[PDB]
Amino acid sequence: SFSGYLKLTDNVYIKNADIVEEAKKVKPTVVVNAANVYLKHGGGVAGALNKATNNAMQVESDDYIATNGPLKVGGSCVLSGHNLAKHCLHVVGPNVNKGEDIQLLKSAYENFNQHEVLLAPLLSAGIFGADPIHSLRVCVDTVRTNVYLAVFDKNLYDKLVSSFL
């Protein structure tokens, strides 16, 4: 199961790790993807998770979008986890670089509450443009289920832990 995590709260844990490598090792029930509304897994966490599935995540996602249309910003869908997990919970945090409402980050984290335990990245962080310190704060104040956060960047991980209130 999960190893090497620092406990932040009763239910939130954090580790400096590549979420793809973490998913391949743990094979959790749920891995969260930092998705966009189109499920176009081009870059960031989504590009990395999709590349690890040999593009099977993108093929499955294109079929999902063809049937259902795009997700809402703040919304999610459950798809296969392929070789990474049992399920992938594709969650759309607001993309600040696309001028989206940062207030939707709490709605995005609420999707995590439908799953007892998740391996996840910080929503809206990285190429989504939000402040990762703010994302961690929203995570701890919103998610009530067990969330194991993988932060790829060591320097950001250290800043997140050292500034955690």
Curated annotation (Swiss-Prot):
Topological relation to the membrane, as annotated: Multi-pass membrane protein
The organism's place on the tree of life at top rank: Viruses
Catalytic activity entry: Thiol-dependent hydrolysis of ester, thioester, amide, peptide and isopeptide bonds formed by the C-terminal Gly of ubiquitin (a 76-residue protein attached to proteins as an intracellular targeting signal)
Regulation of catalytic or functional activity: Inhibited in vitro by GRL-0617.
Subcellular location: Host endoplasmic reticulum membrane
Result after altering residue 162 to L: In strain: Gamma/P.1
Occurrences of domain Macro (ranges): 1-165
Oligomeric and partner information: May form homohexamers. Interacts with N protein.
Functional note: Responsible for the cleavages located at the N-terminus of the replicase polyprotein. Participates together with nsp4 in the assembly of virally-induced cytoplasmic double-membrane vesicles necessary for viral replication. Antagonizes innate immune induction of type I interferon by blocking the phosphorylation, dimerization and subsequent nuclear translocation of host IRF3. Also prevents host NF-kappa-B signaling. In addition, PL-PRO possesses a deubiquitinating/deISGylating activity and processes both 'Lys-48'- and 'Lys-63'-linked polyubiquitin chains from cellular substrates.
Protein name as it appears in the record: Papain-like protease nsp3
Organism classification: Viruses, Riboviria, Orthornavirae, Pisuviricota, Pisoniviricetes
Parent-record interval covered: 1027 to 1191 of 7096
